[PDB]
Structure 1
Amino acid sequence: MFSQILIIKPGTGISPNIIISEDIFPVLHSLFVEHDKKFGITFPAYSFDKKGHLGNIIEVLSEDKEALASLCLEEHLAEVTDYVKVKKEITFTDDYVLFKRIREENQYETTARRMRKRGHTERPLEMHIKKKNQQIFCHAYIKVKSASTGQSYNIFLAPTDIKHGSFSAYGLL
């Protein structure tokens, strides 16, 4: 489907990850919440070696050649331009590896509270947190702040093989 490719300009001091997290996410999520129809996000350079990176490059994907123009890409990112360039041609294509959202247990105290009142009252838990968190953590992230809960959380990512489907507000499957 149609797509608009996003560079971060390289060799500027700041890392890709920081620039991607702070700039691109907030404005894309605000635009995504606004224009309700679920768009999609793909990273053309995922390269999991022992841990997993995210690359210089991201792709916004959608299935309407005018919906991308309804997002007004190159005029929204008009402050931080020195670190981001937004190409302006919504070219269709049929090659991509879509991504999803992996989750990660939660700290022992926050599980406990639910773990007691919910019932199922009173070391087996700690093994579950340690194993489940240790397995996942070695993937990529995109630190996220909050508008409501006003909290800091990290949204991990991982590939999949669906090649079509229905997406979410942040951008994954």
Structure 2
Amino acid sequence: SQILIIKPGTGISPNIIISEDIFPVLHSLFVEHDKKFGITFPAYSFDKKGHLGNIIEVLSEEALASLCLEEHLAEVTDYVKVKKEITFTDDYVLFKRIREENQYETTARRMRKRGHTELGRPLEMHIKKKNQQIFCHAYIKVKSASTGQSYNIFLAPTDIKHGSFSAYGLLRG
């Protein structure tokens, strides 16, 4: 594992520097390598609402040496600290994404194009009910690759303690 430190008290909150500084550049590095890696929030703290934390940790099973993180994160030094050591340890929790359904309009189209004709209130119950529980979890914005949309992902503990990965570096089914 390699620990990337958010430098505190530098201005902005840790979550925006998580959202637009480390995650975007990591996404490209993770997808271009065919061996997938993983993202862990050691300081993840679910008090009332999520608070990602002050640390991110990049995890795997030599491929991290092929990630070349010294030179892909040299533009945000006055913001992100790159610990050069790559140690291995077992005190890790891996992280999965929780789907937030979709805006009523999005679902309405989907459920009208190939679904039933009459469909009202029950979507306004189902979407809203699941979302509130989902929206309180920790959120990361990510700029799109081929759709041009602002996806607010929602991260949550899994405890799976070993597993496969996605291109964002999280657990998948």
Shift of 1:119: 2.2
What's the CA shift for 1:60?
0.2
Corresponding residue for 1:156? 154
Which residue of structure 2 lines up, in the alignment, with residue 58 of structure 1? 56
Once the two structures are TM-superposed, the CA of residue 117 in structure 1 deviates from its matched residue by: 2.0
Cα deviations across residues 58-103 of structure 1 (Å, max 9, x unaligned)? 100011xx11110001111111100111001110111111110100
Equivalent in 11, 24, 31 of residue 29 of structure 2: 31
Distance 1:80 1:130 in 2: 38
The separation in 2 between residues aligned to 1:101 and 1:18, in whole angstroms, is 18
Identity of aligned residues (%): 100
Match of 1:129, SS state, is: helix
How many correspondences in the alignment?
A: 169
Q: CA deviation digits over 1:22-64, x for unaligned, max 9?
A: 110111111111111110111101111111111100100011x
Structure 1 SS opposite 2:11: coil
Question: 1-side partners of 2:52 and 2:106: how far apart?
Answer: 30
Partner of 1:78: 74
Alpha-carbon separation, structure 1, partners of 2:166 and 2:5: 23
Q: Distance in 1 between matches of 2:73 and 2:130?
A: 38
C-alpha root-mean-square deviation of aligned residues, in Å?
0.9
TM-score by length of 2: 0.95
For structure 2, list consecutive stretches of 5 or more residues without a partner in the other structure: none
Deviation at 1:157, TM superposition (A): 0.2
Task: Give the match's secondary structure for 1:153.
Answer: strand
Write 1 or 2 for the structure with the bigger share of strand. Answer: 2
**Structure-1 separation of matches of 2:8 and 2:47:** 22
Q: Which sections of structure 1, spanning at least 5 residues, go unmatched? A: none
Aligned-partner SS, 1:92: coil
Deviations 1:111-157 (A, max 9, x none): 11111121222011101111011111000011011120011111110
Whole-Å Cα distance in 2 between the matches of residues 119 and 138 of structure 1?
Answer: 30
CA distance in 1, matches of 2:83, 2:113: 53
SS at match of 1:157: strand
